[PDB]
Scaffold this active site. Structure first.
Site, mmCIF file in Angstrom:
data_model
loop_
_atom_site.group_PDB
_atom_site.id
_atom_site.type_symbol
_atom_site.label_atom_id
_atom_site.label_comp_id
_atom_site.label_asym_id
_atom_site.label_seq_id
_atom_site.Cartn_x
_atom_site.Cartn_y
_atom_site.Cartn_z
ATOM 1 N N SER A 19 0.835 -1.192 0.000
ATOM 2 C CA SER A 19 0.000 0.000 0.000
ATOM 3 C C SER A 19 0.872 1.245 0.000
ATOM 4 O O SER A 19 2.017 1.214 0.450
ATOM 5 C CB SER A 19 -0.937 0.008 1.208
ATOM 6 O OG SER A 19 -1.517 -1.267 1.410
ATOM 7 N N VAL A 21 0.364 5.903 -0.658
ATOM 8 C CA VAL A 21 -0.307 7.112 -0.202
ATOM 9 C C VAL A 21 -1.780 7.122 -0.614
ATOM 10 O O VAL A 21 -2.632 7.619 0.120
ATOM 11 C CB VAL A 21 0.406 8.380 -0.743
ATOM 12 C CG1 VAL A 21 0.579 8.307 -2.258
ATOM 13 C CG2 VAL A 21 -0.337 9.646 -0.334
ATOM 14 N N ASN A 136 2.428 12.415 -8.755
ATOM 15 C CA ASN A 136 3.106 11.456 -7.884
ATOM 16 C C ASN A 136 4.226 10.711 -8.604
ATOM 17 O O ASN A 136 4.272 9.482 -8.600
ATOM 18 C CB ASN A 136 2.107 10.449 -7.308
ATOM 19 C CG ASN A 136 2.674 9.676 -6.127
ATOM 20 O OD1 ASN A 136 3.731 10.017 -5.596
ATOM 21 N ND2 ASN A 136 1.975 8.624 -5.718
HETATM 22 N N1 LIG Z 1 2.380 -3.181 -12.431
HETATM 23 C C1 LIG Z 1 2.956 -3.596 -11.308
HETATM 24 N N2 LIG Z 1 3.614 -4.781 -11.310
HETATM 25 C C2 LIG Z 1 4.194 -5.200 -10.183
HETATM 26 N N3 LIG Z 1 4.231 -4.607 -8.988
HETATM 27 C C3 LIG Z 1 3.569 -3.431 -9.015
HETATM 28 C C4 LIG Z 1 2.933 -2.883 -10.091
HETATM 29 N N4 LIG Z 1 2.354 -1.652 -9.751
HETATM 30 C C5 LIG Z 1 2.674 -1.527 -8.485
HETATM 31 N N5 LIG Z 1 3.405 -2.562 -7.959
HETATM 32 C C6 LIG Z 1 3.905 -2.697 -6.608
HETATM 33 O O1 LIG Z 1 2.908 -2.277 -5.704
HETATM 34 C C7 LIG Z 1 3.556 -1.973 -4.450
HETATM 35 C C8 LIG Z 1 2.802 -0.885 -3.721
HETATM 36 O O2 LIG Z 1 1.973 -0.152 -4.645
HETATM 37 P P1 LIG Z 1 1.769 1.417 -4.500
HETATM 38 O O3 LIG Z 1 1.389 1.695 -3.094
HETATM 39 O O4 LIG Z 1 0.776 1.966 -5.529
HETATM 40 O O5 LIG Z 1 3.191 2.026 -4.878
HETATM 41 P P2 LIG Z 1 4.063 2.869 -3.887
HETATM 42 O O6 LIG Z 1 5.422 2.250 -3.836
HETATM 43 O O7 LIG Z 1 3.456 2.867 -2.452
HETATM 44 N N6 LIG Z 1 4.211 4.446 -4.461
HETATM 45 P P3 LIG Z 1 2.850 5.420 -4.184
HETATM 46 O O8 LIG Z 1 2.278 5.929 -5.569
HETATM 47 O O9 LIG Z 1 3.276 6.667 -3.316
HETATM 48 O O10 LIG Z 1 1.786 4.657 -3.462
HETATM 49 C C9 LIG Z 1 5.020 -1.656 -4.773
HETATM 50 O O11 LIG Z 1 5.889 -2.551 -4.088
HETATM 51 C C10 LIG Z 1 5.114 -1.820 -6.300
HETATM 52 O O12 LIG Z 1 6.319 -2.466 -6.695
#
Ligand SMILES: Nc1ncnc2c1ncn2[C@@H]1O[C@H](COP(=O)(O)OP(=O)(O)NP(=O)(O)O)[C@@H](O)[C@H]1O
Ligand SMILES: Nc1ncnc2c1ncn2[C@@H]1O[C@H](COP(=O)(O)OP(=O)(O)O)[C@@H](O)[C@H]1O
Ligand SMILES: [Mg+2]
Ligand SMILES: [Mg+2]
Lengths: 269, 293
Positions: A19, A21, A136
């Site tokens: 998860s 933001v 973002n």
């Molecule tokens: N298309 C994808 N394929 C594989 N892993 C993904 C993909 N999209 C997101 N992730 C993974 O999802 C996890 C958490 O998702 P997410 O919370 O949206 O990104 P985040 O790192 O927290 N950046 P943020 O946009 O601030 O939330 C991360 O460890 C990413 O590597």
């Protein structure tokens, strides 16, 4: 580059990836209603914080996001409305660029670093030329399609919620003002992450003192491998006045010229 | 997929551009007035470390286009790239509303001011040493391929009476290995081709060097005074130059006149100037007639 709509029965969430933001990303599967096939996908769940209850219907920002397509962005395969919004994309196993550069570090070629700068710049340029503001952009939100190609992810998500501090421009922190310029700022911070092999921006500081430092004239320090030529770019990205900052076209171009001769601009061994 | 490479074997510029927050340095007084911005005298305390450092702080008027503050950023680039005893160094910049360059303070400041206020304690050997140091600085600038498009007595700072340095770099441009000329204002310091065709080379800064030395030998007189900025091309085209300074012998004025030749290749090199003026500097009362010594 047309938006596809899913039914809630078509999607199944298998495991939580993590998860952030805005929403929660699940590794899941798509099963069309007619069939028994399971196709591996990435389902991001965003909770409706409108109060007007309007993720039940496909909005026009949704169709906007569902539209966009480019070689260096993560295309939206489909979306599923309802209580919670579900954004369906491709599952990129190689993970984010942040973890990648943190894991391989200097072992990656300078050519790869510069070229990745160029690619990210191209993606952001595409987004900008179709009126899409990211809000973002970071090293975590740039995923590896190929070991040599990257794509920008999580664009347009921020404007789905009612009205990350270390990647935001000053006007964004102060007045909640978001433009393509602020995306240029965030791009600067992202490239900084890239060239430092995944360092934490403003590590020693706390979130409270970051805008202070920015208003006093302080910036992120010059990366060890960065020539003054490459650091000047990031510096011009972190300008307080928006219209001074580079455009994504200019960024892509100067990173292209730099990419045409890597050892002159990055010193790694 | 990946960008195709074609390498130019030049060295990576690993100059460190340090950035300082405004609260690290204080502004004491004003040193310089202009349309460009403002130059301050102040103190810089790096936090952590013990020392407080006398500094000059140049602060700028906001951007015109994406280009106007390109000016100040290229200036910072150049001042961060150079390293020489006779050209001094950027210590860092403060990126605020208004960009602020921060350099080491030179107590005695402008050299023109100095030769103007101390007219009758300036002896042969100090003037000649100054010419040598300036020649050295310009030689270093030439050997790192950047052209100082604004060399003049105004832009030479005095660290100590013995020691002077070169500074402006607001108009300075870096030639590629590729290039030999630069195509683009101080009228009375530029070479003829710079006025007629906007051409700037290392041999134009030699003309500027001649005018500079002329300023020093006349104790801060104004070049072509009474003659407006328009016209001057005609004058140079007839073959008229700056007059021979009273304290100069025919040999020094020979060097000066040689710096102001039409043919840019006929003009001396900064190397040659270092050699010549260093040779004259070992018997200074021979080449300059001044009554104080
Ligand atoms: N298309 C994808 N394929 C594989 N892993 C993904 C993909 N999209 C997101 N992730 C993974 O999802 C996890 C958490 O998702 P997410 O919370 O949206 O990104 P985040 O790192 O927290 N950046 P943020 O946009 O601030 O939330 C991360 O460890 C990413 O590597
Ligand atoms: N580091 C410094 N120490 C002392 N005086 C300085 C310094 N930098 C600039 N000055 C003052 O500014 C003038 C020249 O500065 P310069 O950088 O050439 O200004 P500009 O090029 O913007 O006109 C001189 O008169 C000098 O007294
Ligand atoms: Mg994300
Ligand atoms: Mg000046």
């Amino acid at each position: 580059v047309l938006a596809r709509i899913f039914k809630e029965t078509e999607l199944r969430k298998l495991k939580v990836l993590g998860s952030g933001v805005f929403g929660t990303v699940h590794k899941g599967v798509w099963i069309p209603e007619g069939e028994s096939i399971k196709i591996p996908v990435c389902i991001k769940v965003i909770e409706d914080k409108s109060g007007r209850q309007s993720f039940q219907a496909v909005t026009d920002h949704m169709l906007a996001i569902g539209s966009l397509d480019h070689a260096h962005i993560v295309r939206l395969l489909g979306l599923c409305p309802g209580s919670s919004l579900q954004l369906v994309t491709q599952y990129l196993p190689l993970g984010s660029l942040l973890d990648h550069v943190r894991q391989h570090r200097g072992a990656l070629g300078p050519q790869l670093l510069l070229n990745w700068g160029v690619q990210i710049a191209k993606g952001m340029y595409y987004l900008e030329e179709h009126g899409m503001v990211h809000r973002n952009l970071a090293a975590r939100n740039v995923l590896l399609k190929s070991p040599s190609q990257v794509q920008v992810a999580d664009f347009g998500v921020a404007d789905l919620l009612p009205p990350p501090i270390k990647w935001m421009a000053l006007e964004s922190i102060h007045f909640g003002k978001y433009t393509h310029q602020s995306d240029v700022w965030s791009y600067g911070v992202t490239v900084w992450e890239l060239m430092t092999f995944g360092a934490e921006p403003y590590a020693g500081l706390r979130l409270a003192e970051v805008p202070d430092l920015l208003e006093k004239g302080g910036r992120l320090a010059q990366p060890q491998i960065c020539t003054i030529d490459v650091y000047m770019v990031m510096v011009k990205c972190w300008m307080i006045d928006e219209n001074i900052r580079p455009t994504f076209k200019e960024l892509a171009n100067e990173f292209t010229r730099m990419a045409r001769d890597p050892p002159r601009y990055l010193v790694i061994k | 997929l990946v960008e195709p490479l074609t390498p130019s074997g030049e060295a990576p510029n690993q100059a460190l551009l340090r950035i300082l927050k405004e609260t690290e340095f204080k502004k004491i007084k004003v040193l310089g007035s202009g349309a460009f911005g403002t130059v301050y005298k102040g103190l810089w305390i790096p936090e952590g470390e013990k020392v407080k450092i006398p500094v000059a702080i140049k602060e700028l008027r906001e951007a015109t286009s994406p280009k106007a503050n390109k000016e100040i950023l290229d200036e910072a680039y150049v001042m961060a790239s150079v390293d020489n005893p006779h050209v001094c160094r950027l210590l860092g910049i403060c990126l605020t509303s208004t960009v602020q360059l921060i350099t080491q303070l030179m107590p005695f400041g402008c050299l023109l001011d100095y030769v103007r206020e101390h007219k009758d304690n300036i002896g042969s050997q100090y003037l000649l040493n100054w010419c040598v140091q300036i020649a050295k600085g310009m030689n270093y600038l030439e050997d790192r391929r950047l052209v100082h498009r604004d060399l003049a007595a105004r832009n030479v700072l005095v660290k100590t009476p013995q020691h002077v340095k070169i500074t402006d770099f607001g108009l300075a441009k870096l030639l590629g290995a590729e290039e030999k000329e630069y195509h683009a204002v101080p009228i009375k310091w530029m070479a003829l081709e710079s006025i007629l065709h906007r051409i700037y080379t290392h041999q134009s800064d030699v003309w500027s060097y001649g005018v500079t030395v002329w300023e020093l030998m006349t104790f801060g007189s104004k070049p072509y005074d009474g003659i407006p900025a328009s016209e001057i091309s005609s004058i140079l085209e007839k073959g008229e130059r700056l007059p021979q300074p009273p304290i100069c012998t025919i040999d020094v004025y020979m060097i000066m006149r040689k710096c102001w030749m039409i043919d840019a290749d006929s003009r001396p090199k900064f190397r040659e100037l270092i050699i010549e003026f260093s040779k004259m500097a070992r018997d200074p009362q021979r080449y300059l007639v001044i009554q104080g010594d």
